[PDB]
Amino acid sequence: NQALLRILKETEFKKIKVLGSGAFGTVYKGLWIPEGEKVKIPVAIKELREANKEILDEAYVMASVDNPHVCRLLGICLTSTVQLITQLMPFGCLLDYVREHKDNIGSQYLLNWCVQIAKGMNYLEDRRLVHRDLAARNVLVKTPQHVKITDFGLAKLLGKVPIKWMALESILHRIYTHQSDVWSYGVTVWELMTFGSKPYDGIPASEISSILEKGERLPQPPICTIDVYMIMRKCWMIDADSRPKFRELIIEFSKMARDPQRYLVIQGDERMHLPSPTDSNFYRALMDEEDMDDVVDADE
Ligand SMILES: Nc1ncnc2c1ncn2[C@@H]1O[C@H](COP(=O)(O)OP(=O)(O)NP(=O)(O)O)[C@@H](O)[C@H]1O
Ligand SMILES: [Mg+2]
């Protein structure tokens, strides 16, 4: 649908500050200045490094993604460069969030984030869409209780490879499927449960396919019980059809969230509950009016 993607003129918005850059482009905090208005509305703008018909075709798919746990493409400006406009997320990405909060995050948040990421990826799988670059850096925090997958469509649009997130078949043959996204999901879960450790830290990207072929995998995070680590390891089976399905991961992590201290061991966890209804309501009113499923609370 034409209606989902806004074509912006360069005069309608301005880049203000670089937020960073990765494999496909550079992101800026920007301002949208709607013509004839005096308001300045914060947005994120991603300008791609390095056709228009093909670009717009993929942009319309990206703009069609409508799920509480996946970011939608809102607008595009095609000039000499491709610029992608999306909602700005002040909390930033979940990788930085778990690093910065390494001592104040409880099991309920971690297990619910795993549910939310699996729900967003399952939505993509149901639409027959493959992400190709899932990682904790590509999950954005809308509120601490609500996360969203970002950068859907970018890898396809432009495809340093994120070797350390990639299924072995993607590394060796650039094969990407829902089940290779499941491998990346397992790495993403490992990043969360380690509070943002670097996977395979110190090992050169060029050594990784050899390590995987020998059967070596990312280590058990100290907070994870064996059932949680077995899920991660199942995501990294060489046989892609032996890996879990995202819909299975929604079920498993939701079950775990109903008994969180049975599945993760975190110092001080009893002091780290989900927000009260009062605090949740206040967050939603200021930052998060969109429809979403209830978070999974503990039975006890
Ligand atoms: N909508 C957004 N709101 C706020 N920060 C954002 C948004 N989108 C991206 N960022 C941040 O902008 C920076 C650049 O992102 P990006 O160019 O996608 O690199 P990356 O996520 O680190 N790696 P990759 O996506 O794998 O290429 C990172 O710090 C992102 O977290
Ligand atoms: Mg990114």
UniProtKB/Swiss-Prot annotation:
- Ranges for domain Protein kinase come to 13-264
Q: Give residues annotated as binding ATP.
A: L19, G20, S21, G22, A23, F24, G25, T26, V27, K46, T86, Q87, D151
The active site of this protein is located at D133
* Protein location: Cell membrane; Endoplasmic reticulum membrane; Golgi apparatus membrane; Nucleus membrane
Give residues where N6-(2-hydroxyisobutyryl)lysine occurs.
K46
Recorded GO molecular functions are: actin filament binding; ATP binding; ATPase binding; cadherin binding; chromatin binding; double-stranded DNA binding; enzyme binding; epidermal growth factor binding
Mutation: E35K; reported impact is: Found in a lung cancer sample
Q: What is its main location?
A: membrane
Post-translationally, this protein is described as follows, namely: Phosphorylated on Tyr residues in response to EGF. Dephosphorylation by PTPRJ prevents endocytosis and stabilizes the receptor at the plasma membrane. Dephosphorylated by PTPN1 and PTPN2. Monoubiquitinated and polyubiquitinated upon EGF stimulation; which does not affect tyrosine kinase activity or signaling capacity but may play a role in lysosomal targeting. Polyubiquitin linkage is mainly through 'Lys-63', but linkage through 'Lys-48', 'Lys-11' and 'Lys-29' also occurs. Deubiquitination by OTUD7B prevents degradation. Ubiquitinated by RNF115 and RNF126. Ubiquitinated by ZNRF1 or CBL at different lysines in response to EGF stimulation; leading to recruitment of the ESCRT machinery and subsequent degradation in the lysosomes.
Q: What is the effect of changing G20D?
A: Found in a lung cancer sample
> Which positions hold the covalent cross-link Glycyl lysine isopeptide (Lys-Gly) (interchain with G-Cter in ubiquitin)?
K17, K38, K53, K214, K245, K255
Task: Name the associated disease, please.
Answer: Lung cancer: A common malignancy affecting tissues of the lung. The most common form of lung cancer is non-small cell lung cancer (NSCLC) that can be divided into 3 major histologic subtypes: squamous cell carcinoma, adenocarcinoma, and large cell lung cancer. NSCLC is often diagnosed at an advanced stage and has a poor prognosis.
Task: Give the consequence of mutating G20A.
Answer: Found in a lung cancer sample
Q: Which domain of life is it from?
A: Eukaryota
Record-stated family: Belongs to the protein kinase superfamily. Tyr protein kinase family. EGF receptor subfamily.
One GO term under biological process is:
positive regulation of cell migration
Gene name per UniProt: EGFR
Recorded source organism is Homo sapiens (Human)
Q: What is this protein called?
A: Epidermal growth factor receptor
Consequence the record notes for mutating L5A: Abolishes phosphorylation
The effect annotated for E10A is: Found in a lung cancer sample; more sensitive to gefitinib than wild-type
Tissue expression, per UniProt?
Ubiquitously expressed. Isoform 2 is also expressed in ovarian cancers.
Please verify whether the record's keywords include Transferase. Answer: yes
